Amino acid sequence: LELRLKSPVGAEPAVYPWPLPVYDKHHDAAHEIIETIRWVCEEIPDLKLAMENYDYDTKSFESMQRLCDKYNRAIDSIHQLWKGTTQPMKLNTRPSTGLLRHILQQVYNHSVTDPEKLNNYEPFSPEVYGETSFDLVAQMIDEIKMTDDDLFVDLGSGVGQVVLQVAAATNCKHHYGVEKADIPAKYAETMDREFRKWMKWYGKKHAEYTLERGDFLSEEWRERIANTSVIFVNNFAFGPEVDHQLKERFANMKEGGRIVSSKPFAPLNFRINSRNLSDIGTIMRVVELSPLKGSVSWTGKPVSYYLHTIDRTILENYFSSLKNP
Template structure:
């Protein structure tokens, strides 16, 4: 099929697993590169077995997007034809070594979920620099997966937990939690339109590729709302674990956040990048008129122990100097 310079071609990739579902997506000039990267990451051996030539990323990067898209459609069409014509090829598919132990497991391991999240990110957000557009001196930042995995190992969430990311950006934390823990449900709330919109797209790609590989994840829901909105109050009250990157919050927003969190039920655990409560004599009593969380409101407020296996530059995206996170438990 000839490709126009400005193109958007729907495509259905045949199931890779027996009784699996196809993966439907749209080939555009922005999705060619992440799709080729994905094929190299997971499908190099199978396309070679079929006698299909998978051009290197160096080659495709030097092509026009139109020519690269034509090559991508050719490779995908051949793959789908072979999968549909030779179902046994699916059962003999050999995943990369780090995935083999988990290939037939209904849940992902760390390497696989990161691969699928990176794929969804690349498909939904071809130019990450747009996330900082119009933010002035405020840089869009994300917690890195090694540190997130460490924090989750400390939290040990179960099927009785409901997770909430307040200020969820593009939703990566929520999606990771849904794929890698036993929480009952995961929510994300983001007030800025651009990351919220891109988050919806990323979730759509991630849900689709997880289903394609027949991997389980917990229910997730993303909202384009401010966490100060009364509409999301029931979600905040439902949550048993809340994640907030409040490091750059000014005094006004910090006060507003405190007032919101005072509505949390007893036992709610809150992970923040800046302390919610200082251990000082002057903070022992709550000023109900100001809505300040104090030591009287919490049973725990401590820094989460760091892991010596995680380098500082692997912690967060906004600095290479590391970042502490704190765990507060409401009384």
């Protein structure tokens, strides 16, 4: 027994077993199915017209299969439309924000087979797992205009969702994620396959990326970090040991290089005095990113992210001013 959904662009149908699996307390395949249909209607207006003319109950196989079938018919229909004088949909675009949210949720669901195993890290160590919200990454994408000049790195990439979202959204020459712990790195290998497959299924283009197992403190990474123009690092749980080593790594970045983190690498109020010349604040502007409305962590205050920009002008100027009355 099965349910099937035709790709709007001709890829292999998506096949779901019956009964449909549950993912967590508010995610099951039934809603995935419904939502994928909902989203393809969003991408193809004609499909939506063809689809308007309908009830459905998530628990009934016939009721579900009548929906899958109704959608599969309409796809056949649209494909016939495209053989006519009508042009195909825009052939290879970036996904809308909404579609992207769904796609990554879909990818996660099919890959992170057991979400609870992602809590099996050593507590109060740099291994602590946390997931940056899609909206936040969205904000970063919006505020940090990136081009094909840029290279992107998520240090400690988890299962890799930041990389995937950024790769979906921007045109960086390449995007990297590096993660050290087995569990998330294992899952990342699946995330990668699934993301590639789902993007093909919806016919959406994405930039190039690689999810790697490794240590971002190793020798190899020193140089790699220096060539990176944009770095995302969710370091809230790193601790001063690891933060300090990262400061050294960052000291080597090119002008205009950018780092986005959850905990600043230099105080915000930083004036360069006589005693702090060696310090990382000397070479970078640091701003707080605007909080997203209605957003409160366990800290009661809004969750903050910080943007750092390599600006050695700051240093140049303090030296220049050491030659003035």
